[model samples]
Target: ASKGEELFTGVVPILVELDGDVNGHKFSVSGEGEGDATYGKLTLKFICTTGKLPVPWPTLVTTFSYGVQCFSRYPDHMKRHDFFKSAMPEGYVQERTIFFKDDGNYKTRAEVKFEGDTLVNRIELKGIDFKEDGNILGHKLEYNYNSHNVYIMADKQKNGIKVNFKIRHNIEDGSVQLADHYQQNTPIGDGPVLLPDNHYLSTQSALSKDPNEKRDHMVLLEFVTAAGIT
Candidate 1:
């Protein structure tokens, strides 16, 4: 349980047993959960025995702040992959992505900060530049409000082989289709009612950065509630 050190253990049903007792110099690690905050506060709660807290403590790196309210269906989408076209009407596109999840913590990784929609003509918006020369592969993307944590990137990590080809739609209903996806019952001929909510976001650009640019009039926050799944 605590000899050398390691545990990549597979299968998940809350199987955990962390040990930390450095009979050498100084060290520590523990489990069981804390008061409350995402990542189970400190993450470690299952059957029982989760009460070890001390030593070199400070490996906790989880942060989430929320507040969102956006409206952009198109403007710079010369072709932003109709999302799951039943009606992404327009032209152009080959790829489009940006997904995020967290509530019970299914998947979460994030970096976001956005500002705009101040009065109106928000300098043709544009946002991004998460770091690491642009941080696209690992995706630290930023478009602010309503664009939750976001994920997925292929080419499987390029030590060197980056050809970000366009036109990719894995069909998980990628774009934050606030509304149900999979065409949600279908019928789009500029008709009357459609509560499906698949793909719709807007805007006009300018520049916040040239590295993976993305920006729009804004009106959201870091009180950051958060929502997505479509």
Candidate 2:
């Protein structure tokens, strides 16, 4: 009682009943009666103390390894109407050639590597001699899987303006893509999808090495949600 123990803390009752009839022989006779109820009471008391374990202590060990798998499905109008497939090449590297648009109809070539489903990183730019040298802004870029398009920027630190551009290509082979710059303010909240092509101005970059030059570059990425809400 002193150390939080109890005696006869709970009591419960049990009961039993019997009811039946007996029939007999030639003339046939029947008798029925409810037998006297039999009952008993069960008393319970707190015994063992809490927080006591009866197991051996052993050192625990854990290991971890991870991998991934994916698949696709299609409905066939022919017969078996069921089709499924997995994105093959358990691993693959996709290389994309991107053209950088510059002032005076000048263009530079940069090779972008897209590996796996995939990963995005800047490759090398071909031409940039003289003040025509172009550089990436903030070192961050985005790739849109839906359109197989890439969005990159010129050094906003150099131009004093947002120089966002989009590189569009085919999803099948990631080929024949074109790069263009934005005209109006970069669209958000469904503007990109709702706005017309004319709204996005042709590509242009002040790819000069002038340290005094000012530029603006903002990286905007859409969320995985409905276009409008995104």
Candidate 3:
């Protein structure tokens, strides 16, 4: 979980949110952390911005490793996970690609596309060695208007993983509000979750639903995992 402050001529301090579950394990990783250290880890990085549209947007990249158990709660379980084990090899040394597009406007309406490759070595489980592969995992998009923001997200494995995230940017100026809606079929398990009805509404009456209207607001998108990883 993270937040962004201050807006630039181009996208800066890209905002992101993440939600997922591990059957049983614990681990952590940081983009700002010093490294050379290899552990089971997954990372999402906002690379640059493309100001080619009405709103300046961002370009993002994602990286992950199979042997980086430090980032996986259930490192041992990776061999059993659907996508990870099938697409990742043992002993690390693999890399997958994720391309993202943003709508700019401080809020992020993003689309993530996966490059066909493996992020790590293939995994072997129960005397069977699985090979690595790539496919569409999932995606999220969001937009913001004066005083209000709307978000929508979906994944591959689940029918659809969605979330309606709302926030009041004026929390420091004496205004604050919060609400969230979530839907998932793989609750309390090791699979994915989906929320098909994800949207947001705010108290400010001036905010227009029409995209042609000028407004002040922010939106965010969080990609948990790619498809076929139940």
Candidate 4:
């Protein structure tokens, strides 16, 4: 049986969430963490966030990986979103790109700076997408460390509207509140519905592209008129 100590970041490995080598793999190349060593053992310097999803009901099960920093399909070439597609230069401050789609020619970048105690983390995607209204967009992300809130807005001011999410993440207990949500123009039986928060389940991961990636990753929402906050 698998020992409880080892963990899986989709075939990538980790020890207590610092980048680590997979136990039964061929080669070993782990992240330098926030400090420590390289292609090597683990230590301090890991940033993690979690949220809740209603599988049967809401319980926090958000699964993140350094690999999903770019929301990729493969494990190689590279996994660091800051490395491959950061909005800033190659070796600037620490930020990771969180890509969204499968078959996405994806890359993510971040621009982060601190002002006294506030955090200005302006994250941006590196490309347009497969839709007709994919180009001509604008984006920015701002946070206040003093007041415990996230202020985000990427409107249709750039002649297109593909970006989504104005969500607030509670770092205290890993709960996320959707201030404004992306309107999923669903074609399902009852039309548009409000699914639970976009948290992960036991089987959800950003690194899946195995044909039915669309169905597997989607959590059917609850209609706003039919549910209450739990």
Best by TM-score: 3
* lDDT value, residue 223 of candidate 4: 9
TM-score of every candidate: 0.17, 0.18, 0.22, 0.18
Assess the local accuracy of residue 194 in candidate 3 as a C-alpha lDDT between 0 and 100. 24
- Compared to the true structure, candidate 3 yields what TM-score? 0.22
Error of 1 at 63 (Å): 13
- Scored by lDDT, the top model is 3
Error of 3 at 95 (Å): 26
lDDT of 3 by residue, 33-60 (tens): 1111112123333211221121111111
- Please give the lDDT score at residue 227 for candidate 4: 12
Model 1 agreement with the true structure over 1-230: per-residue lDDT tens digits? 21101111111111112222221212222122211111111122222123332211111111111101111121222123222121212111111121212100111122111112110100011112222222222233333223223211222232111111111112123442121111011212342211222233221111122333132111111211112224
In terms of lDDT, which candidate is stronger, 1 or 2?
Answer: 1
lDDT of 4 by residue, 54-117 (tens): 1101110111122122112212221221111122111122223223232112233333322232
Instruction: List runs of model 3 lying over 4 Å from the truth.
Output: 1-42, 51-113, 118-158, 161-170, 177-230
Minimum summed lDDT over a 10-residue window in model 3 is located at: 1-10
List candidate 2 segments past 4 Å from native. Answer: 1-85, 103-230
Flag the better candidate by TM-score, 3 or 4: 3
Better lDDT candidate (1, 3):
3
Cα deviation of 190, candidate 2, in Å? 40
List residue ranges in candidate 1 displaced over 4 A.
Answer: 1-12, 18-43, 46-58, 61-152, 155-230
